[PDB]
């Protein structure tokens with residue numbers, strides 16, 4: 710029960726904060742299926758920050774849970790696809806931790822709306 714514009718402004722800011730936590734930009738764009746040809750054999754729904762931005766501006770995120778669900782896919786896909794002893798796997802663990810704090814704060818501000 711809130712206004713659409715301030716909510717989208719908040720998701721835009723939150724998405725920028727999450728992208729800032731991904732310092733290697735390894736989640737900024739879709740996993741290049743031509744460089745990882747078996748990726749879609751394992752990953753039911755790829756997700757990345759660029760796609761999240763397009764979804765945001767297409768009005769696909771009208772509540773905080775749908776935004777956070779796609780962030781969680783970025784993390785879970787990476788944990789699933791990559792072995793534990795890799796930089797990619799540990800980067801998804803770090804993003805889960807650092808991103809989770811960004812999301813809790815942003816969700817509090819959405820609840821103020």
Ligand SMILES: CC[C@@H](C)Nc1nc2ccccc2n2c(C)nnc12
Nearest residue numbers: 735736739740741745787790791797
């Ligand atoms: C051996 C498969 C590894 C290299 N997987 C990934 N490669 C990526 C390459 C470019 C951008 C993202 C990539 N990625 C992500 C995200 N999760 N796993 C991989």
